[PDB]
């Protein structure tokens with residue numbers, strides 16, 4: 001909850017010892033993966049939020065593509081891509097592992113994650129469509145993707161996606177399900193009983209809900225962000 | 238080996254000391270697994286599937302009916318090309334294809350992300366109107382390949398993951414291998430380093446195993462776009 005850094009800001013000091021730095025943004029569902037993984041693993045970390053509409057120019061040294069999340073370790077290593085940063089964290093900090101250890105069981109989770117692979121672009125295309133234009137086309141595509149997730153979970157008959165306890169796969173796909181209310185997409189999940197239950201269950205984990213934003217604040221952030229407002233990334237601070 | 242199709246006998250249980258791979262001889266996704274099975278000396282039996290006359294029993298092997306699919310002597314079923322490859326490097330640490338430093342592993346997975354759009358683009362190019370395909374697609378491939386060209390220019394190494402052949406190289410190879418057959422050779426005109434990497438990959442023994450000439454590949458596609466039950470076995 002620290003103000004984002006923007007154009008004309010001082011590039012950060014060296015990473016604190018015993019700490020991993022994450023370049024983030026408070027509303028970014030991709031960055032929330034890393035943050036939730038860092039948190040659920042008790043890894044000591046300093047968060048540096050980035051103003052994605054007023055990016056500090058030195059941030060392109062941290063990531064040529066200019067996207068969060070980004071890891072910076074005490075050694076100066078820079079890791080990019082939310083799924084990759086999480087995998088890097090479950091391997092470079094082999095303490096409380098979020099992936100199972102049996103490669104067959106790990107792969108069985110990665111396969112479940114593939115069922116989610118279309119969902120972020122769909123939600124992004126829904127956010128970036130004409131507001132007063134209610135597109136059934138996008139919403140229908142999400143229903144199909146969510147049906148594969150609904151079906152997938154019914155087959156495993158477990159509480160979570162990767163099994164009975166909370167696994168990496170659950171943090172990986174959660175940020176989008178959490179935003180469905182604010183995005184007024186709750187009808188893409190009407191035909192998904194098992195999914196609603198899993199969502200509720202995720203609301204009770206301390207980590208999956210740590211950075212909960214009321215639906216109201218999130219919609220106003222989107223309004224500012226779609227207008228490329230330099231205040232979007234810090235709205236609500 | 239001839240593909241298995243509708244009305245065929247489901248295969249016997251996987252021989253011990255052997256891992257089964259459900260494949261298709263022209264499939265670039267399965268080519269990932271096969272090259273990984275090869276370059277790691279893993280003993281494996283290949284079962285090609287007729288993707289235009291799928292045997293009904295293949296859907297118990299994969300509800301989605303896609304290849305590649307792994308089956309081990311224990312009956313474990315692994316799906317998705319990248320997942321089968323990662324599984325193989327983790328159940329068989331003889332000849333490591335990923336580096337062991339997580340940062341360097343991550344640095345290769347990050348490089349792989351530059352490739353993520355390329356397979357769907359190529360599929361869209363293949364399934365477009367034969368006469369007057371689309372320069373629009375070709376432009377998206379040019380932009381996508383620019384990220385790979387620059388990435389290799391930045392690392393200034395012979396391969397993508399460093400100086401020896403890494404998982405990353407086998408992961409993205411099948412599509413560059415087909416650029417000739419697909420007549421996309423102009424999407425790589427402004428990519429000097431890529432051309433070089435391609436030439437080198439044709440000389441790797443694994444990346445060239447069971448070589449398919451551009452004409453044969455072109456004929457397989459033609460039969461495949463017409464849903465021919467003979468596309469998968471064409472050329473045997």
Ligand SMILES: N[C@@H](CCC(=O)N[C@@H](CS)C(=O)NCC(=O)O)C(=O)O
Nearest residue numbers: 028029030052067068069081082083
């Ligand atoms: N594929 C990336 C996506 C990350 C991403 O798109 N982050 C957004 C914020 S949610 C961003 O940095 N936006 C800045 C931009 O697109 O210029 C991942 O998984 O890390």
Ligand SMILES: N[C@@H](CCC(=O)N[C@@H](CS)C(=O)NCC(=O)O)C(=O)O
Nearest residue numbers: 264265266288303304305317318319
């Ligand atoms: N994402 C999958 C894609 C596999 C795929 O599309 N395979 C094709 C052959 S190249 C297939 O099985 N086609 C059959 C069908 O689409 O019905 C992976 O990487 O394994």
